[PDB]
Amino acid sequence: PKRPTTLNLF
Amino acid sequence: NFYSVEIGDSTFTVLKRYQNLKPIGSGAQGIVCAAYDAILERNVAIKKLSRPFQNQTHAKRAYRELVLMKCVNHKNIIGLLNVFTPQKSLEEFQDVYIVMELMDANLCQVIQMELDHERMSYLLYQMLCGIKHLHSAGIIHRDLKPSNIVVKSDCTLKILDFGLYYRAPEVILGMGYKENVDIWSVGCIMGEMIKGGVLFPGTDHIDQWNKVIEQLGTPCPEFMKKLQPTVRTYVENRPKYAGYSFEKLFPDVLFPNKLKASQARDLLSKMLVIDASKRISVDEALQHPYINVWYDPSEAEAPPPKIEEWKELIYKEVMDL
């Protein structure tokens, strides 16, 4: 399981 | 050495390394500016304490924030980057400036976004780690909420402050609390991500209380006994509230993957427990199968942190750099 490298704040 | 910028009605006198200041906050604590750190070459947050010591009340809070910010150290907690005073001596000592990490946004909007279980359980994993470190430091926030949790575009998360609808019953009421008081908040924030709107909307602490009971169901009599005389009468005067099942409260119509949707609910089912004595603990939450996937001992279990007289204490704190 790879950890999220991005989260879309916009 | 320093220079002065005028922001609003206050004057920010700070180290020349900081530029492009812009106010992003202004509360009881003080004024917070977004600023560019020309040495670390990154965006930081400069907080100028308001009336550090204009009354024994303010000074203790100032002394409180400084000392804690110093010892406390974790990735899932706002990191201190500097503390300085533009004043040359204790005699003239007047202002306290705290520089810290600057994040991109709080969870107020990202919560109303679309997060996959990865992002969902990961952000929560990171909350549990920060809250746990806070706890292992004798600090029990009690006031965690969306505008309290900050995040970055790289999906990392941190706790903004050490605190003191997202409050736990023990808190809404004049009852005693333990560390799992903050699990309620996590339970609330987690649930709101799945819902899309605040879980228990209360027009006032009483209505708030009603929303929760009606929703989760009335607590058992052993808990009622632990309730203040006046408030116990109030609850015993309302209709029988049985609450709903977490499948009804949290229908699959909100989840994307059969296993994970059930796990998230099962977890929610152990965090949103009125009776604090039947509520899950952080350690257990971190071990839950929905959160445990990101578990890492280096994160989840990092070693703990550690009158006119207040002017000197603070000054001494600040002067230790």
Side-chain angles (χ1 to χ4, degrees), chain B residues 97-110:
Chain B
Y97 291 89
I98 303 169
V99 190
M100 48 182 89
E101 282 184 292
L102 179 56
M103 299 296 268
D104 303 320
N106 51 51
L107 291 172
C108 274
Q109 183 74 200
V110 181

PDB file of all heavy atoms in Angstrom, chain B residues 97-110:
ATOM      1  N   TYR B  97       7.248  37.131  18.810  1.00  0.00           N
ATOM      2  CA  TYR B  97       6.932  36.657  17.474  1.00  0.00           C
ATOM      3  C   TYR B  97       7.317  35.194  17.341  1.00  0.00           C
ATOM      4  O   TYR B  97       8.448  34.812  17.612  1.00  0.00           O
ATOM      5  CB  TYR B  97       7.697  37.474  16.429  1.00  0.00           C
ATOM      6  CG  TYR B  97       7.249  38.919  16.272  1.00  0.00           C
ATOM      7  CD1 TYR B  97       7.815  39.928  17.043  1.00  0.00           C
ATOM      8  CD2 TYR B  97       6.302  39.279  15.319  1.00  0.00           C
ATOM      9  CE1 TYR B  97       7.461  41.251  16.870  1.00  0.00           C
ATOM     10  CE2 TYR B  97       5.943  40.603  15.136  1.00  0.00           C
ATOM     11  CZ  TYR B  97       6.531  41.580  15.915  1.00  0.00           C
ATOM     12  OH  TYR B  97       6.218  42.892  15.712  1.00  0.00           O
ATOM     13  N   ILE B  98       6.372  34.382  16.900  1.00  0.00           N
ATOM     14  CA  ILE B  98       6.602  32.959  16.739  1.00  0.00           C
ATOM     15  C   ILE B  98       6.469  32.581  15.268  1.00  0.00           C
ATOM     16  O   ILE B  98       5.413  32.774  14.663  1.00  0.00           O
ATOM     17  CB  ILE B  98       5.568  32.171  17.554  1.00  0.00           C
ATOM     18  CG1 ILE B  98       5.642  32.599  19.020  1.00  0.00           C
ATOM     19  CG2 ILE B  98       5.797  30.686  17.402  1.00  0.00           C
ATOM     20  CD1 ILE B  98       4.507  32.087  19.874  1.00  0.00           C
ATOM     21  N   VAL B  99       7.540  32.063  14.680  1.00  0.00           N
ATOM     22  CA  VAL B  99       7.482  31.646  13.283  1.00  0.00           C
ATOM     23  C   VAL B  99       7.227  30.133  13.282  1.00  0.00           C
ATOM     24  O   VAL B  99       7.793  29.400  14.096  1.00  0.00           O
ATOM     25  CB  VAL B  99       8.807  31.954  12.526  1.00  0.00           C
ATOM     26  CG1 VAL B  99       8.613  31.728  11.036  1.00  0.00           C
ATOM     27  CG2 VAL B  99       9.247  33.383  12.786  1.00  0.00           C
ATOM     28  N   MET B 100       6.358  29.672  12.392  1.00  0.00           N
ATOM     29  CA  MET B 100       6.046  28.253  12.318  1.00  0.00           C
ATOM     30  C   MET B 100       5.836  27.822  10.878  1.00  0.00           C
ATOM     31  O   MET B 100       5.949  28.630   9.954  1.00  0.00           O
ATOM     32  CB  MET B 100       4.807  27.941  13.168  1.00  0.00           C
ATOM     33  CG  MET B 100       3.641  28.873  12.934  1.00  0.00           C
ATOM     34  SD  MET B 100       2.240  28.498  13.991  1.00  0.00           S
ATOM     35  CE  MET B 100       2.611  29.495  15.457  1.00  0.00           C
ATOM     36  N   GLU B 101       5.547  26.542  10.687  1.00  0.00           N
ATOM     37  CA  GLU B 101       5.332  26.033   9.351  1.00  0.00           C
ATOM     38  C   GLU B 101       4.068  26.629   8.787  1.00  0.00           C
ATOM     39  O   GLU B 101       3.149  26.960   9.529  1.00  0.00           O
ATOM     40  CB  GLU B 101       5.206  24.519   9.378  1.00  0.00           C
ATOM     41  CG  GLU B 101       6.518  23.812   9.512  1.00  0.00           C
ATOM     42  CD  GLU B 101       6.370  22.311   9.450  1.00  0.00           C
ATOM     43  OE1 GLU B 101       5.790  21.731  10.394  1.00  0.00           O
ATOM     44  OE2 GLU B 101       6.830  21.712   8.450  1.00  0.00           O
ATOM     45  N   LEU B 102       4.028  26.784   7.474  1.00  0.00           N
ATOM     46  CA  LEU B 102       2.841  27.316   6.841  1.00  0.00           C
ATOM     47  C   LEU B 102       2.269  26.217   5.968  1.00  0.00           C
ATOM     48  O   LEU B 102       2.978  25.669   5.113  1.00  0.00           O
ATOM     49  CB  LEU B 102       3.170  28.537   5.974  1.00  0.00           C
ATOM     50  CG  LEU B 102       1.971  29.173   5.243  1.00  0.00           C
ATOM     51  CD1 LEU B 102       0.880  29.570   6.231  1.00  0.00           C
ATOM     52  CD2 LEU B 102       2.426  30.392   4.481  1.00  0.00           C
ATOM     53  N   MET B 103       0.998  25.882   6.193  1.00  0.00           N
ATOM     54  CA  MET B 103       0.330  24.853   5.400  1.00  0.00           C
ATOM     55  C   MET B 103      -0.570  25.480   4.326  1.00  0.00           C
ATOM     56  O   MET B 103      -0.771  26.696   4.295  1.00  0.00           O
ATOM     57  CB  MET B 103      -0.488  23.926   6.301  1.00  0.00           C
ATOM     58  CG  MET B 103       0.336  23.170   7.334  1.00  0.00           C
ATOM     59  SD  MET B 103       1.563  21.972   6.727  1.00  0.00           S
ATOM     60  CE  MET B 103       0.581  20.407   6.702  1.00  0.00           C
ATOM     61  N   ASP B 104      -1.118  24.640   3.454  1.00  0.00           N
ATOM     62  CA  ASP B 104      -1.954  25.101   2.350  1.00  0.00           C
ATOM     63  C   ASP B 104      -3.430  25.396   2.663  1.00  0.00           C
ATOM     64  O   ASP B 104      -4.017  26.327   2.098  1.00  0.00           O
ATOM     65  CB  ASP B 104      -1.838  24.102   1.199  1.00  0.00           C
ATOM     66  CG  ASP B 104      -0.400  23.902   0.751  1.00  0.00           C
ATOM     67  OD1 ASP B 104       0.363  24.893   0.697  1.00  0.00           O
ATOM     68  OD2 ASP B 104      -0.036  22.754   0.438  1.00  0.00           O
ATOM     69  N   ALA B 105      -4.030  24.606   3.554  1.00  0.00           N
ATOM     70  CA  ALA B 105      -5.432  24.794   3.951  1.00  0.00           C
ATOM     71  C   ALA B 105      -5.804  23.873   5.111  1.00  0.00           C
ATOM     72  O   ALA B 105      -5.063  22.960   5.464  1.00  0.00           O
ATOM     73  CB  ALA B 105      -6.355  24.520   2.764  1.00  0.00           C
ATOM     74  N   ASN B 106      -6.952  24.124   5.716  1.00  0.00           N
ATOM     75  CA  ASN B 106      -7.404  23.279   6.800  1.00  0.00           C
ATOM     76  C   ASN B 106      -8.320  22.249   6.164  1.00  0.00           C
ATOM     77  O   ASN B 106      -8.463  22.225   4.947  1.00  0.00           O
ATOM     78  CB  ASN B 106      -8.172  24.096   7.826  1.00  0.00           C
ATOM     79  CG  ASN B 106      -9.257  24.949   7.196  1.00  0.00           C
ATOM     80  OD1 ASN B 106     -10.090  24.458   6.423  1.00  0.00           O
ATOM     81  ND2 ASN B 106      -9.258  26.238   7.531  1.00  0.00           N
ATOM     82  N   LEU B 107      -8.947  21.401   6.971  1.00  0.00           N
ATOM     83  CA  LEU B 107      -9.839  20.387   6.425  1.00  0.00           C
ATOM     84  C   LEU B 107     -11.277  20.861   6.217  1.00  0.00           C
ATOM     85  O   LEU B 107     -12.158  20.045   5.957  1.00  0.00           O
ATOM     86  CB  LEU B 107      -9.848  19.158   7.329  1.00  0.00           C
ATOM     87  CG  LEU B 107      -8.569  18.329   7.365  1.00  0.00           C
ATOM     88  CD1 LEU B 107      -8.703  17.282   8.438  1.00  0.00           C
ATOM     89  CD2 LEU B 107      -8.309  17.674   6.015  1.00  0.00           C
ATOM     90  N   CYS B 108     -11.515  22.168   6.316  1.00  0.00           N
ATOM     91  CA  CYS B 108     -12.865  22.707   6.151  1.00  0.00           C
ATOM     92  C   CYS B 108     -13.470  22.474   4.788  1.00  0.00           C
ATOM     93  O   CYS B 108     -14.682  22.298   4.665  1.00  0.00           O
ATOM     94  CB  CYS B 108     -12.891  24.203   6.447  1.00  0.00           C
ATOM     95  SG  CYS B 108     -13.113  24.612   8.182  1.00  0.00           S
ATOM     96  N   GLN B 109     -12.632  22.479   3.761  1.00  0.00           N
ATOM     97  CA  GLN B 109     -13.128  22.266   2.413  1.00  0.00           C
ATOM     98  C   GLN B 109     -12.775  20.881   1.905  1.00  0.00           C
ATOM     99  O   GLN B 109     -13.595  20.226   1.269  1.00  0.00           O
ATOM    100  CB  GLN B 109     -12.567  23.318   1.455  1.00  0.00           C
ATOM    101  CG  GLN B 109     -13.118  23.198   0.027  1.00  0.00           C
ATOM    102  CD  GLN B 109     -14.561  23.674  -0.106  1.00  0.00           C
ATOM    103  OE1 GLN B 109     -15.266  23.321  -1.063  1.00  0.00           O
ATOM    104  NE2 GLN B 109     -15.003  24.495   0.849  1.00  0.00           N
ATOM    105  N   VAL B 110     -11.551  20.441   2.184  1.00  0.00           N
ATOM    106  CA  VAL B 110     -11.099  19.129   1.742  1.00  0.00           C
ATOM    107  C   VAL B 110     -12.034  18.058   2.285  1.00  0.00           C
ATOM    108  O   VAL B 110     -12.150  16.977   1.713  1.00  0.00           O
ATOM    109  CB  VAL B 110      -9.659  18.838   2.215  1.00  0.00           C
ATOM    110  CG1 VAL B 110      -9.213  17.491   1.716  1.00  0.00           C
ATOM    111  CG2 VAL B 110      -8.720  19.897   1.688  1.00  0.00           C
TER     112      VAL B 110
END
